[PDB]
Design a protein around this ligand. Structure first.
Ligand SMILES: CC(=O)c1c(C)[nH]c(-c2csc(CN3C(=O)CNC3=O)n2)c1C
Length: 103
């Protein structure tokens, strides 16, 4: 629906963010040993983009839950001072700041 256009925009802003590079596609289990074993519910921005593109979100709250899941997964798997771990903390605040502009 057009009701979620503002979420398409937030997602775009996230995809184009300097700290977005870890989160653009699903983590590859061939490259990150045991990732999908440790992280039960992987999530990434392309998966979110596809769900928006097909109209698969029933609410903006569902979209925000997926965003937070990206960052919760990152914090679960990565150290705070690692490059991916640093990026996840940057991106969480970015998402939160944009969400707070509507809520
Ligand atoms: C373990 C973890 O939580 C990771 C996440 C969420 N993301 C990445 C990661 C590393 S690299 C990358 C994107 N990427 C390529 O796949 C090729 N060049 C490039 O920048 N994502 C990791 C390791």
């Amino acid at each position: 629906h057009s009701d979620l256009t503002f979420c398409e925009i937030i997602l775009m802003e996230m995809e184009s963010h300097d700290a977005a590079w870890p989160f653009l596609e699903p983590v590859n289990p061939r490259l990150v040993s045991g990732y999908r074993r440790i992280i039960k519910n992987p999530m990434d921005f392309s998966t979110m983009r596809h769900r928006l593109s097909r109209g698969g979100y029933t609410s903006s709250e569902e979209f925000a839950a997926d965003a937070l899941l990206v960052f919760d997964n990152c914090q679960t798997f990565n150290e705070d001072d690692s490059e991916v771990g640093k990026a996840g903390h940057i991106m969480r605040r970015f998402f939160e700041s944009r969400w707070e502009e509507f809520y």
